[PDB]
Structure formats: structure tokens, C-alpha cells
Design a protein around this nucleic acid. Structure first.
Ligand code: MG
Ligand code: MG
Ligand code: MG
Ligand code: MG
Ligand code: MG
Ligand code: MG
Ligand code: MG
Ligand code: MG
Ligand code: MG
Ligand code: MG
Ligand code: MG
Ligand code: MG
Ligand code: MG
Ligand code: MG
Ligand code: MG
Ligand code: MG
Ligand code: MG
Ligand code: MG
Ligand code: MG
Ligand code: MG
Ligand code: MG
Ligand code: MG
Ligand code: MG
Ligand code: MG
Ligand code: MG
Ligand code: MG
Ligand code: MG
Lengths: 98, 69, 242, 125, 173
RNA sequence: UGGAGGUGAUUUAAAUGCCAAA
RNA sequence: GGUCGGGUCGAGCCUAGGCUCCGUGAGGGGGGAGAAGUCGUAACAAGGUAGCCGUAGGGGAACCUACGGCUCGAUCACCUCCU
RNA sequence: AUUCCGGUUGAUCCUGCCGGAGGCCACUGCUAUGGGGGUCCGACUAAGCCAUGCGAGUCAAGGGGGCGUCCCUUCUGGGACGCCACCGGCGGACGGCUCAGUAACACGUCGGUAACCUACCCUCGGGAGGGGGAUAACCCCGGGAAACUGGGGCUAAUCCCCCAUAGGCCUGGGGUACUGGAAGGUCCCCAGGCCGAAAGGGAGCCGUAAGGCUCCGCCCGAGGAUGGGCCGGCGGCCGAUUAGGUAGUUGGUGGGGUAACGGCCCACCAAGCCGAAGAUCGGUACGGGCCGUGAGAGCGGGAGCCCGGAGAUGGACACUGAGACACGGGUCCAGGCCCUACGGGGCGCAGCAGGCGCGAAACCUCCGCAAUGCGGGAAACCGCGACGGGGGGACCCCCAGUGCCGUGCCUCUGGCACGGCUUUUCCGGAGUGUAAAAAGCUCCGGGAAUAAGGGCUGGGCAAGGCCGGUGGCAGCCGCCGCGGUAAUACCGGCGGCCCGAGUGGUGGCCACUAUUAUUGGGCCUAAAGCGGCCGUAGCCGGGCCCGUAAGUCCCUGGCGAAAUCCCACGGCUCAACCGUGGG
């Protein structure tokens, strides 16, 4: 699905793990609902800014739901402004429109 | 999608979420969504006649902010 | 056919008795109404072009037909949609060759060479018989054509008999009754293209069709429908058969 | 207008939702209420397959047949009774099975005037 | 319903990482110089099909079964996989190496046309080998027994000359 | 040797788990 | 073809009533996570008054009490019935 | 391959669910040398809205005209020859597109019509007699912004209308010739009525003329063929937190109407019809041949190719015709949109391309009627966005490449150095191919030259106990679990493993799963035996003898289209694909 970023948040890991996971709130263009999506990669949250548009998909946990130590988050970000996020995190490409 | 973007901007800035259409047309779904989510749209054909309307609406909202305060 | 008759025919839906390549092209020739039915006849164009091979394309096939080169039952046929069916005769007088159209052992139509002397006769099965104005008798044949006879002769003809007709004059020259000991040739069904002699006839109530038993040359007996049994002689065939 | 296709009710009583438009070959026509008059009047209808029907709208003569096989063409006075409808007799409507009175006695109609265009009756005793 | 879709002609392993299977397949791949695993898998499927047909016909009876039984035996011994007096039981003792020995590449190597398997592959692909008067450029083509002895250098090839330098080195072994 | 039931009784008060482990 | 009279079929439109869906919604109610707030210690050993089921009353809160039941109850003495 | 592996404890055996490992479909990250074959590509959300071009014509051998060129005599003219529109005939009801509606005789299958229509086509039997009439084209004058449209003059036909005869239909009375299992049918003879044909037209030779001789045609009757209409038995979804439903409703008698039978519709007379073996109502959906998966029994889907149904912005209704209530024909209402000189007038791509909108999600505003077919024509021929040919695309399947050899050296799989070889693939030419091209195929010249990525690396599960960063932070993690200054698990280097022109991510269905159990599961303590009993339908039912033949078994006739599936042989280099046979 395609959506618009509303704000950035951070979610605590489940016990007994420790840490904060970087996420965004997304408003879906097709029906106007608001969901939460995880941003994978080391330092990936720097490439997201408010009012960007993103492509999201499922996160791949049991029964099509959440996974790991982050319950409550069911999706992850795949593209940002029509550029692959994995590329941006590795390098090999630079975010357009500054 | 323009109305969605306008609502996203309005979320944190009431006075900057608005659309100014100059000699364009508004779709049925767009106007329905704007009416549902209460987003203001100013359509027009004359540049000053369109800008002055936005200015005066902003002024009216500003005065109504403190009228009930 | 939402509003009216069909005028087209796809290759994949063509009758199963033709020799034709079903995936080579999209369309096939939809035959014209005429003598036989769709299950026991084929258009003339395929006989000219695909079977005998005197033409490569349809366009030059139509040039042969429009010059009057083919005779069916002794009559010139120019229509490339005209149906040719069981027991018909195909003659090319310019090359001097004659054929009889017959079903195969698997049910498909083939051309069987014959002599010029035998090419002037055609056997016709009597499919129905009725009274017509002036108190005359009209005989309706297996290929759809009709003949008239006087009220004096009415007891020489019954359904399932075979009449040997001389073409193109259409004059009767023999009658072959349907009875025990008659020689028959099968034209449809699982036992198609087998031949033999009649042994028994059986009948049933309420409009179920009747069945016959046939003995072949080797001494085996087999059954079929009565209307699938074509009489061809008294105790030997009167025409050449494969 | 007059559709003779099918009923919209199942024999159990439930309703049927129509699944297509009305086809042209399923329509009927206005009944011809053949009356008694001074002068006869008929029209021609072009029907399915391009055939024809002769429709009789006003009748003044009739053909009456005796048990011996002879027939006479006489004129019609009135309709005594008509078992098909309760008020056909008053309005002088002629249908098959009606009893008409003539100048040579009462007769019972044996033809369908709206489908044939003539009135044939057999004499009563 | 749905129209026809063309299906693959080979089958993949049920588990991708099994140690013993990997070892066995590596031995075969190195010996016969195949390009990739699917090539090998192709031949495996052929073998299994033959076996599956033999198991079905041992348990059948009737008139069509006997026809198909003799057809299977005839096809098997036309390809050179069975001796001319073999019976249906002998179908169940075939192995994968029997099929890999019938490839055009292997046969070109064994007849002495080339010094190596890889050289044989190239000889075939570049078009220097003729089979029964016709040039074939598929190294995986399965050779019929009746045509095995008409396998030579193409009559237009550089190698169809006993004085060519590379041919002489091949003869040297 | 090992079991299954029944009837009697049973003498003050006495709550909680933090630094850690990392 | 126009105008009028008669008979019949009819989409749509208006009013009233009865059902039902979507959006907002003052006020109220429990559920689920969180664990560096708070008051007690009900369950596990006879858990310090054995625990639990049904019904009824009472109490900041876990809970307490009465009548009938179960063992998925510890210890000692005596009795009964077996192997 | 008829299969297992990780997870509940300090350790163990169970029940039970979650995860891994396989196949196929849609979207998507990174990366890509070549050819062949095929039924692939705006179906999922919007059966939403659409500028422009094209998607249906044809006949000069049916008829009078206009224009042009030549020949004869020409004051005129008469000829031939070729174009153009109009009248007239046939076609436009097929073909193409989409899947909204519909749980129904819609569809599959076996039967029926003795209860029905059919232009084109085939066979046999007959007929073509006598009159009349207008009008387009063309000339004069126009009206209106346009869309359209008025009056007067003159003319023809295979155009239209009469009269006759043949012929058709209805009813009553007789006779018994035909088919059939069986006559409200066919045939013959009387009698009373109603309707009611035709173009001896056109072309060519012999004709001095008289007139033949072919070619194409007009009307009626009997039958067939082709294409349909209508009817019946049987077969295939989910819900009781939907239990009673129906009142032209079920049947009868008498009619009307229809091409035809029928509550199809009326008038009268009754109280029937359906239902716990699930009526009625609500949900979801076009049906099938088939397709995916599985050892099988099964479970799931039904866009693309073929056969049937339905629709043309939503809802109603008619004209012509053999056939329509008609996608590129008409009328009204509702709802959009366009042009006006403001008086009015027009248009709905669910045809091929193309555009906007919606979305995660889908191509060129191309060439040809040469092949296959259809409509028209006596024929030669003409038209066809059907169909055929190409263009764009990691759609499916098949066959290939990114070098090979010898001798040395090396960390001996591999890498390097020498010497040689080949040219699939790449660059430039000739031929063949094609409607014309492009690909492809056969030759010629140059040259190892022009060509490797993606994921993983603690266990499951193949592969490192190496080095540098970070320090419960950052991050990883399908599941189990790693990370707290000495990380084989995070980030990077160097190694290694798997598959390879591909390789990974997300969502769906089958398998795994004997976690739906007929084959084939459970219910003392783990989920699960009604608190107890009596009994209606249903299911299950003791021994022997005689009969029957419904179930059941065997043999044989008529059916269940083609494509798709399996096998052998044959044609494209083999294959994929296509043909002939057997299942
Ligand atoms: Mg379908
Ligand atoms: Mg304590
Ligand atoms: Mg306590
Ligand atoms: Mg206690
Ligand atoms: Mg108390
Ligand atoms: Mg436990
Ligand atoms: Mg489609
Ligand atoms: Mg659409
Ligand atoms: Mg149509
Ligand atoms: Mg639907
Ligand atoms: Mg007349
Ligand atoms: Mg379905
Ligand atoms: Mg397009
Ligand atoms: Mg796509
Ligand atoms: Mg690493
Ligand atoms: Mg290992
Ligand atoms: Mg599972
Ligand atoms: Mg179990
Ligand atoms: Mg109990
Ligand atoms: Mg109990
Ligand atoms: Mg009981
Ligand atoms: Mg018994
Ligand atoms: Mg029986
Ligand atoms: Mg079939
Ligand atoms: Mg070959
Ligand atoms: Mg082959
Ligand atoms: Mg084939």
C-alpha cells in the first residue's frame, strides 16, 4: 500500500530485551486509515521526513501478523519517494528532491 | 492525494493547510473527502480575486481564534 | 446467436468427420444448406483443395469450380459451399476419374475410386413415404430428394428399401427390399463401415428405435440400429465397396 | 405491454427476480371483442415469420349448418348468452361457444372469429 | 475453467541442503561436465518416468496394457539402454549413469573425437560434429543406437583434414 | 506383606523481599 | 397527421407511516498490554481458619459467613473391611 | 520420497498449537548475452468519463441521367469507351467486446414437440394472362447561424397498385388411400364463407428478317436441410442468533391471445399448493469442458482458448424485417457533458489504438487484405482494427553462450607465464526468406575478442572458532534466541556455501496435518458422555422354506463435441510445438 508519513515515533522492545525501535505513522491513501510501520536498517530513520510518501508491506510474522520483540507493528517501509530504502541504507543511491 | 497532503500539513499547522486552485476543476471524490475532513479549497480565475479571498479567510480565522478566548 | 442465425464456423468446432487440420488457422467453411446433414457431408472446397490437391489456395480453387470442371451426381456444381455426402459420386471428366464418397472404419469421409460404368448409378434409401394431391405417392430419400409414383405401384415401396437411381436423368432401374438375407453396409455408430447379411429384426414399445442383427463374412454377429443399415444388394453388393 | 412469457411466482409461493429483458417474440395483442353490427369489418395482422391473421371486429352474417351437411348464410340478430364472460351477452360480444339468435333459429358458434375472420355456427334443436 | 499452461519438464529436490545428496550430485556434475543442476535434474526425471511406467504395467491386464508393454520395451532398446533380449523386470534396474552415457557429448568423447569432455562440448556447440549427415548443436541430445556409428567430423569443418594441428594433438592420445 | 474406608481430636501472636544479576 | 371522447398498461415524482445502513456524538462500562505508584496478603506445605462446587446475604480490595455436596485434604489415636 | 525437523522442564515422557523445508498464482528490490515455440499482457479498485482517426459494404448483366474521349454520316444525331452520383436489390440480427445482473429449466446430460416458425440452399410437380400510377436524379426559386428543410416543372425500372386464375385458412357431412408405437395430421367427394401470386425481366451468338440456342433470373405447392422457440426427468453453494409461507395463490369448467402448448391473461366454481428429507427470507456468485495441488482418498479455483447465457450510462417502450424491441438505427424520463447569432441543436469506445481518473497492479494514436473466412457480384474482382505481420514487456515453456588444448610454476580445486586452435555469440558483406520489410537459415572477411549476478554464512540447514569497528547503545530475529568493553549471531574487510540469466521480499491456495479423520482421530486424570429416564421420525436389526427381480453382478445396442491428458511412430537441427493412429 501507499501512504503519507505523519510523524516519527519510537517503540520499546519487549522484555527481556532492551532498546528502541524506529517507526512511523502512515495515513493510507486508499481509505484514510492510520497504521504504524517499522523502518528496517541501521540509521534508516534519517532518510524519512514528515510529509514523505512511502510504500509499505507486511512484516512477515506468524499468521501474517507481527514478529519478534515488537508486537503491535504489522508493517515495514519498502520505498521512500519511489526509491528503495535498502539502497539508501547501503549507499549506491541518493534521495531525490533533496 | 492533494487533499490528503493538505490534511497532513494541517495536522501541525492550521493556517497552512489549504488549496488554491487557479482555473482548474475539482473532482467528485476530492470534494467529498474535503467536505468530510473539513479542508478548505479556494477556486478562482483571477489571481488577486483568489489571493485576497484566502487572506481575508485567514484574517477571519485569526479574529475568531480570540473572539471566544 | 443472440438475435439471428450464425454465419461463421471456428476450426475447433468443426464436425468430427472431416479430414482437416484444426489448429492451422482460425476459421473454417460453414456449409450451405443442401442435400445431406452436417454430420454426413463435407463442403466441396475441401474436396478440391485438401483431398485431391488440384489447388493450393482457395482463390484458384474457386477459378476451377467456376469453369464447370466438377460434377456431383452428374450435375455441374459451382458453389464452393455445396455439401457432398454419403454415396455421392464425384466425376472429373477432363481427367476422366470417378469417386464414391464413403465413411471410414473410424467414421471419416474418404473418396473410393470406381469404374465409369458404375458411376452412373446411385443408391437411395427410402426415408419416408406420403400421399400427395391428385392421390399420388411421394417418396422422400435419405439425401433429401423426392420422387413421384402412381397409386398402382404403391405396394412395391416401403421405408428402408433401397432404390437404384440412374443419374442425372433420375430414372428408377431397381428396387432392393429390406428383409432377411439382404446385404447391408453400416453408415454410423460403433460398427461403422462393417458389412454383411441381415439375420434378425427386433422392435420395442413407445417409440424406441428398432435394432437389427448382422452376420459378417467370418461368421461374427453384431447389432446396430435399423436406420444405420443401408441395403446394397440381394445377396451380393451391387456397387463397389472397400 | 402484454407479456406472455412466464409467471413471476414459484409453485411454492416464493418470488422470482427477472434475469433478462422481455423478448419481442413473447408479446400478445389486444383482444378483439367481436360485436354484432349492420356491416362487417375486418383487418389483417402481419405475424411472426411474416404470416397473416384475419381479425373480425364487427359481424353481421353467419354460416349455419344442419346435421345433414347443408349450410346457409343468414344474418345475426343478437347474442342470447355467452358462458365465457358474465357481461358478454349484454354488450353483444361473440366468441366461440356463444349462443346467437338468427332468422332461422338459435345456433352455437364453433369457430374463433378473432383468429379466423368468419362466424360459423351449428343449429340447435 | 482455465486454458492450458505449459509445465516444466524436470523436478527439483524436496530439501535443498542435504549433505549426502549434494556429495553424490557433485561427483556426477564433475565427471560429466554439465553446466548446471537443472540439466542433471532433467535426466533424472526421464529415468523416473520410465520406472513409473514399468511399475504401472506390471500390475495391469487387458489388451491395451500388452500393447503399451511392448511399446515401452521397444523404445527402451531402440535408445540403446537395454539388450535386445531384455524383459520388463530389467527396466527397474536402470541407473542415472546409463542415461548420462547416451548424451552426444559423452559419445563424442568416448569415440575419440576429442581429448576431453569440455573439448567435446565446444566441438559440438561450434558445429564441427555431424550425425547421420546432419549437424546437431545440442550437447544433451540423446543418441539412438542405430545412428551411433555415423558420427563424424562435419565435411566442411576445419577438423575434417588429417593435417590440421588441433586434430593431430587429439589423435596423439 | 501391601492397600481402602469411618469416627474423634490437633494449646496465643508471626506481614513482606529489597541492593544484586546486567 | 392534428383535436376531442372513452377503456387499459405504465417509468418517474410528491405525502404519510413502518424497517434498516453509514458519519459524528455529551455521558457511562468492562477487556488487553506496561511495571521504579499505592493498600493489604487470598492461593501453593496442615500456606498458618484444609481447599473447591451450587445458592443467598455482607464487605476498601483480594475475600468472609450460613445450608447441602466432593477429595482434586496433612498428622495422631482408636475402629471396620480386604489382600 | 506413502518422510520429517526446532520450540513448554534442572532433567523426562505426552497432548497440543506455532515456525521451518516443496509446488503454483499476483505485486515488487537488485541484476541481465542469444535464439525458437505458444491459447500471455487495464480481469481484481471505477459495467468510471472520453478529443481525434479508423472498426460494413457491395452490384454498371435492374433503371433513367450528367461529364469526357474517339468513329460514321454529322446542320441534328447515332454509336462505342470510361467515370460520377441518384432510384432499386441483397447485407448491416453474424463477426468483435465485457462479466454488471441472475441461486433460475441459467447451465450439463438424456428425451419430447402428434403443440411451432425459418430469407439464403437442394429435389420433384406446376405457373408467368390484362391494365394503371407516382417519384428521386435533372431544370427554376429558396429558407435557416447551423443541424436540417419548402414550393413548382419533367422521367424510368426486376419500384408501387388493381382485375383474373392458381393457391391458402375456418366449420359442417361422408369415404378409408399413407406414415407411425399410437392420428385433433396427410389423401378423395359434397356444402357455406373469408383471404388472395408472379419480373418471360436482363446478357451473348446464329439470325437479312422471321425466331431459336445457351447464361442469370420471377411466383405457388410437397418434403428436406440450416438456424432457432417451447417442455420434462435427473445432477452441482453457505446461514435456524431466518419457522411457518402463498390468495391468480393450487386445481377445474368456458373463453381470449400467441408462430405454438400453458394462470400466459380474463369470467365463474372450489380450497388447494410448498415445508425440519429445511419451505420462505438473507449472503455470495455468470454455468461447463477444464486448471493448481496431493501416493491416493481428497481439498481449492473457474479472467485469457471452445461451447451456452446476459448487457451496451440507469429505467421503460416501439418501427422495419425471414430474424431485433437492434453496441457504430428511433422515442420518453433521470443523470452528465458539448456547440449556438440565444431562436435552437447535438453526444455516451464494456470495438482497435490513444488520453484522464482510480489504484500495489497492465503495450504502438504502426503495415496489409498476400494467407484463413464472411457479405456482395454471372464472373474477373471489391471491403473487412475479424484475421494475418511486425513494435513495447524479466508472461509461460524448450535449446545455448560468457572459451578450448599442450608444457611449465604456484597456495596445486584454482591462478599465472609461454605456444597453438575454434567462432555458437559479436562487427561488416552476398544469397534465400517476406504482400513489402524485419527476424531466421546457407556462405565470405576480421578477431578471445563483445558478455555474471542475487541471497546466505549460531541451530533448524550446506558453509569461518579469522581480523577491525560498536558496547543492553546501535542493530539482528519466520521460530528458538543474540547484543551488559575478550560478539563464530549486529556493521565492514578477507575467506567459504547454494542456486545461476537469474536470485531475494510481501500477500493467496494445496501439501505439511490422522490439526476435519469414508479409507483414518478423540471424550477416567490433558478440549470433550446431556443431572436421570421414557419415547415419535431416521439409522441398525435372529433361524429355515417358497416366489419376485427393485438394488447388485455379467454380456450387448445408442450417447457423453473439439481442444486439453498418456503412449508409439512421423515433420520442423533434436526439443518445446504440430500431424497420423491406440487409449
Ligand atoms: Mg469461466
Ligand atoms: Mg514470603
Ligand atoms: Mg494466607
Ligand atoms: Mg488458607
Ligand atoms: Mg460478616
Ligand atoms: Mg508443562
Ligand atoms: Mg481480459
Ligand atoms: Mg475498467
Ligand atoms: Mg450482435
Ligand atoms: Mg458479479
Ligand atoms: Mg388477387
Ligand atoms: Mg461457481
Ligand atoms: Mg491501449
Ligand atoms: Mg503486471
Ligand atoms: Mg559478515
Ligand atoms: Mg552444517
Ligand atoms: Mg502448519
Ligand atoms: Mg488428537
Ligand atoms: Mg452422564
Ligand atoms: Mg457430567
Ligand atoms: Mg429411548
Ligand atoms: Mg437375518
Ligand atoms: Mg435389477
Ligand atoms: Mg472430447
Ligand atoms: Mg528432422
Ligand atoms: Mg521426436
Ligand atoms: Mg495435435
Amino acid at each position: 500500500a501507499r501512504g503519507i508519513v505523519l510523524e516519527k515515533i519510537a517503540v520499546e522492545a519487549k522484555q527481556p530485551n532492551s532498546g528502541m525501535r524506529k517507526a512511523v505513522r502512515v495515513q493510507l491513501i486508499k481509505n484514510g486509515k492510520v497504521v504504524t510501520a517499522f523502518c528496517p536498517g541501521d540509521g534508516a530513520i534519517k532518510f524519512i521526513d514528515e510529509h514523505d510518501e512511502v510504500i509499505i508491506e507486511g512484516i512477515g510474522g506468524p499468521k501474517g501478523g507481527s514478529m519478534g520483540d515488537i508486537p503491535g507493528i504489522r508493517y515495514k517501509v519498502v520505498k521512500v519517494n519511489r526509491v528503495s530504502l535498502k539502497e539508501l541504507v547501503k549507499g549506491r543511491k541518493e534521495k531525490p528532491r533533496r | 492525494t492533494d487533499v490528503m497532503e493538505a490534511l497532513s500539513v494541517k495536522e501541525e499547522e492550521p493556517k497552512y493547510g489549504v488549496i488554491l486552485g487557479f482555473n482548474v476543476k475539482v473532482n467528485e471524490d476530492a470534494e467529498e473527502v474535503a467536505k468530510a475532513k473539513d479542508v478548505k479549497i479556494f477556486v478562482g480565475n483571477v489571481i488577486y480575486k483568489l489571493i485576497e479571498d484566502y487572506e481575508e479567510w485567514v484574517k477571519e480565522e485569526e479574529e475568531k481564534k480570540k473572539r471566544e478566548l | 446467436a443472440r438475435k439471428g442465425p450464425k454465419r461463421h464456423l471456428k476450426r475447433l468446432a468443426a464436425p468430427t468427420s472431416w479430414y482437416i487440420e484444426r489448429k492451422a488457422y482460425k476459421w473454417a467453411v460453414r456449409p450451405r444448406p443442401g442435400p445431406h446433414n452436417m454430420r454426413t457431408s463435407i463442403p466441396l472446397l475441401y474436396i478440391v483443395r485438401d483431398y485431391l490437391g488440384y489447388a493450393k489456395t482457395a482463390r484458384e480453387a474457386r477459378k476451377i469450380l467456376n469453369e464447370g470442371k466438377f460434377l456431383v451426381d452428374g450435375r455441374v456444381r459451382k458453389d464452393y459451399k455445396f455439401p457432398v455426402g454419403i454415396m455421392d459420386v464425384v466425376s472429373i471428366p477432363e481427367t476422366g476419374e470417378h469417386y464414391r464418397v464413403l465413411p471410414n472404419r473410424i467414421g471419416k469421409l474418404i473418396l473410393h475410386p470406381i469404374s465409369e460404368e458404375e458411376a452412373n448409378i446411385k443408391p437411395l434409401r427410402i426415408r419416408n413415404k406420403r400421399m400427395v394431391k391428385g392421390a399420388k405417392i411421394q417418396l422422400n430419400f435419405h439425401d433429401g430428394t423426392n420422387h413421384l409414383i402412381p397409386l398402382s405401384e404403391k405396394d412395391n415401396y416401403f421405408t428402408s428399401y433401397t432404390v437404384l437411381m440412374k443419374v442425372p436423368e433420375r430414372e428408377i432401374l431397381e428396387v432392393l427390399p429390406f428383409e432377411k438375407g439382404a446385404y447391408v453396409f453400416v453408415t454410423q455408430g460403433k460398427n461403422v463401415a462393417r458389412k454383411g447379411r441381415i439375420v434378425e429384426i427386433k422392435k420395442f414399445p413407445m417409440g424406441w428405435p428398432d435394432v437389427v442383427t448382422i452376420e459378417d463374412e467370418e461368421g461374427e454377429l453384431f447389432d446396430t440400429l435399423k436406420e444405420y443399415a443401408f441395403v446394397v444388394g440381394r445377396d451380393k453388393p451391387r456397387i463397389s465397396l472397400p | 405491454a402484454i407479456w406472455q412469457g412466464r409467471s413471476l411466482r414459484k409453485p411454492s409461493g416464493g418470488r422470482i427476480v427477472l434475469a433478462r429483458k422481455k423478448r419481442k417474440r413473447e408479446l400478445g395483442r389486444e383482444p378483439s371483442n367481436t360485436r354484432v353490427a349492420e356491416q362487417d369489418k375486418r383487418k389483417i395482422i402481419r405475424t411472426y415469420g411474416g404470416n397473416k391473421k384475419v381479425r373480425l371486429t364487427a359481424a353481421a352474417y353467419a354460416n349455419v349448418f344442419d346435421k345433414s351437411g347443408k349450410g346457409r348464410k343468414v344474418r345475426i340478430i343478437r347474442v342470447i348468452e355467452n358462458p365465457a364472460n358474465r357481461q358478454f351477452a349484454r354488450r353483444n360480444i361473440i366468441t366461440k361457444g356463444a349462443i346467437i339468435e338468427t332468422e332461422i333459429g338459435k345456433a352455437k358458434v364453433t369457430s374463433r372469429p378473432g383468429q379466423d375472420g368468419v362466424v360459423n355456427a351449428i343449429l340447435l334443436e | 475453467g482455465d486454458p492450458k499452461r505449459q509445465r516444466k519438464k524436470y523436478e527439483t529436490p524436496p530439501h535443498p541442503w542435504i549433505k549426502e545428496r549434494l556429495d553424490r550430485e557433485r561427483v556426477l556434475m564433475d565427471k560429466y561436465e554439465l553446466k548446471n543442476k537443472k540439466e542433471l535434474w532433467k535426466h533424472e526425471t526421464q529415468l523416473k518416468n520410465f520406472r513409473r511406467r514399468a511399475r504401472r504395467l506390471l500390475a495391469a491386464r487387458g489388451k491395451q496394457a500388452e500393447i503399451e508393454r511392448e511399446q515401452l520395451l521397444a523404445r527402451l532398446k531402440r535408445l540403446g539402454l537395454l539388450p535386445e533380449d531384455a524383459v520388463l523386470d530389467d527396466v527397474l534396474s536402470l541407473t542415472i549413469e546409463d542415461i548420462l552415457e547416451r548424451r552426444l557429448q559423452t559419445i563424442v568423447y568416448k569415440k575419440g573425437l576429442a581429448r576431453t569432455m569440455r573439448q567435446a562440448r565446444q566441438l559440438i556447440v561450434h558445429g564441427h560434429i555431424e550425425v547421420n549427415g546432419q549437424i546437431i548443436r545440442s550437447p544433451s541430445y540423446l543418441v539412438l543406437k542405430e545412428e551411433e556409428d555415423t558420427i563424424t567430423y562435419a565435411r566442411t569443418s576445419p577438423f575434417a583434414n588429417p593435417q590440421h594441428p588441433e586434430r593431430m594433438m587429439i589423435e596423439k592420445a
